[PDB]
Amino acid sequence: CRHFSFAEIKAATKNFDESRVLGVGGFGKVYRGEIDGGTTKVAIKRGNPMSEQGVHEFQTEIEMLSKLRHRHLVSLIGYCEENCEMILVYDYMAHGTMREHLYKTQNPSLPWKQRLEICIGAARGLHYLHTGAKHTIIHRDVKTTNILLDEKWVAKVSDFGLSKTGSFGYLDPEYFRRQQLTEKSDVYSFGVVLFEALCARPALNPTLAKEQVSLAEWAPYCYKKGMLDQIVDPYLKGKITPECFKKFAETAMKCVLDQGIERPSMGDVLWNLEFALQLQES
Amino acid sequence: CRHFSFAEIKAATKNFDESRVLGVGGFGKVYRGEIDGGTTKVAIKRGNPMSEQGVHEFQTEIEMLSKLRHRHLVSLIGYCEENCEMILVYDYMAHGTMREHLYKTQNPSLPWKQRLEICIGAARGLHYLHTGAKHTIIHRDVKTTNILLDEKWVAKVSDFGLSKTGKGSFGYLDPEYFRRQQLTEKSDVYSFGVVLFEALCARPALNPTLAKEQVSLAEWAPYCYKKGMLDQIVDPYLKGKITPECFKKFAETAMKCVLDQGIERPSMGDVLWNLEFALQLQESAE
Ligand SMILES: CC(=O)c1cnc2ccc(-c3cc(Cl)c(O)c(Cl)c3)nc2c1N[C@H]1CC[C@@H](CN(C)C)CC1
């Protein structure tokens, strides 16, 4: 894992210029930068060493991402810990978050096949976390702002600060009851992501009618009452084949079951999403 | 990727002591060793730097394995090319090859669930090669001697010397390759299908002494399945131990893998899912 000096980061970001700011992470700001003679675009997250939690999440990202390698995970290029700084350097994800292409945005709507391919890419990343490392890795914070899109629209999981070997609307309700650490909690959060891709609304909207506040509760309720199609993204109305719609909906439904033991594995989710894409074509 | 000096390897192997030789062949010789104050046990392949292809395969393994990280791939700990040597250091795979637990061995036969879990693990490694690296990696030499087993019987794919970005190997060769078609990851699927049939039948992929229709397992086993007699060529240890639903799922998957035309073959993700489903179909009925 590559070590940057503070001067290299300052150079890459043009001295943390305001016009390079891309947004804010948990404990600081994110900048567009370039390294290695301007040959490599990067994103650079500047954190907060005076936060106990910020330090813990910094070290957790480095411990995780310095040993993982997968097409559908955002790559950690390096870090900087000089000058009482905690800075992380990532590959540049030119199209930002999944979420900003779904709603509350001026970005155009995504075609259905592209949405399905994004969900498949994210599922491949999560499947790798659950089956491809030494031990199961539980992300703990899967959500549409933690799935980023590169210039080819390839989806990649980010934000490993809370990983182990939360966010309102994605929290596994069974955790507060059984208090067990399980990769099925990631499955639950990913089910919410699936419904977000389909319905193009936030996982949690506290202004709504009680029954609608949580997408994880509302979407299954609608599907079983035969009216999921009534809360689908208006852009997608009429664009999903019946067999694809059924397979996608059933998969997302199973992800958000009350009881982690009844939820599918991510490998099962991934296979069913690939099957759904085939059924969109046939 | 870690760089070893010749002194480190000489020390790790007790100067290539012959009581540490794990294997010997055209690849070179493989030794058991220990590194880092004796905290990490390793296998050390000392190859021949005068062979042109030996150097090519050395460089290719280093290319590939330095960038990949997966539980079901043998880890490359490091290499050494000092002193005109050509040495690779691997995590130790205490139970050796999958082939030496199937046949022509004094080793006990593998329980059926254990063979399925081994096939699933190898499938996970191949699936990673096909979908997890920056570009598709085609292993090109999947076979039962290139699936190694660690102390916990975890299966891991080895030997990337022939791999490309996209231990007899005759019985595993994709026939569509002899028709000069463009090579794809479906050639790995084909070879893996042969592995599945070996796991089931516990005989070589290619036996040149047999009746002509039995020589190639990739031809013989589908033939027997379609004639309703696959269960007659199953490993005798497995007779009566596979549930009907598991047997059918496993055999159908293997048969799709060895179809003549790659475009008709399943992806490795499809194979993997169907093997996990086969295992569940074994466990639910018992
Ligand atoms: C906008 C853009 O082009 C871009 C390009 N490449 C990136 C590469 C990595 C990360 C990244 C950001 C944060 Cl806050 C992280 O914690 C991690 Cl682990 C990675 N972000 C970007 C990135 N933008 C960030 C900026 C906003 C941030 C979340 N907001 C709260 C909504 C996430 C997305």
Ligand SMILES: CC(=O)c1cnc2ccc(-c3cc(Cl)c(O)c(Cl)c3)nc2c1N[C@H]1CC[C@@H](CN(C)C)CC1
């Ligand atoms: C026996 C034992 O305990 C052991 C333990 N750990 C290992 C770890 C790695 C490798 C390995 C060997 C070769 Cl020749 C390779 O090319 C590669 Cl990539 C890895 N081999 C072993 C290994 N044995 C080797 C020695 C025989 C060799 C020849 N095959 C039958 C054909 C393959 C297996």
